[PDB]
């Protein structure tokens, strides 16, 4: 499903060995994407830049009467895909878990979901890129 124009790609991130980068790397490999270093001499290789990762925890107390407590975790990822010489495309992922409230394994799993959401945006970018002529 990854467009053919994106089967070779650069992954640009501030921490290539962090959990988000690994999760995105992992999904790109699973989809048959060859990842190049940023200093490649190849031409026109698109880049996926991981710009921002945010993790928010919300604790809410609701008066019913009697009270109820609810916990949310929200993971938001903002990234950009650059098609050299053409355009830059912002994409994002948002992953939501709510509870009854281990934490670290939940987050690990959220990163995989965030990575799948990003990769699923690539077709819409190629569609726009084709129509821009």
Swiss-Prot record:
It is found in: Cell outer membrane. GO terms for biological process: Gram-negative-bacterium-type cell outer membrane assembly; lipopolysaccharide transport. One of its GO terms (molecular function) is lipopolysaccharide binding. It comes from the Bacteria. Keywords: Cell outer membrane, Lipoprotein, Membrane, Palmitate, Signal. Transmembrane segments: none annotated. It is a lipid-anchor. Together with LptD, is involved in the assembly of lipopolysaccharide (LPS) at the surface of the outer membrane. Required for the proper assembly of LptD. Binds LPS and may serve as the LPS recognition site at the outer membrane. Component of the lipopolysaccharide transport and assembly complex. Interacts with LptD. May interact with LptD during its assembly by the beta-barrel assembly machine (BAM). Directly contacts LptD at a wide range of positions, encompassing multiple surfaces of LptE. In one specific interaction, LptE contacts a predicted extracellular loop of LptD through the lumen of the beta-barrel. This specific interaction is required for proper folding of LptD and assembly of the complex. Also interacts with LptM, which promotes the efficient assembly of the LptDE translocon by the BAM complex. This is LPS-assembly lipoprotein LptE. It comes from Escherichia coli (strain K12). The chain holds residues 28 to 170 of 193 of the full protein.
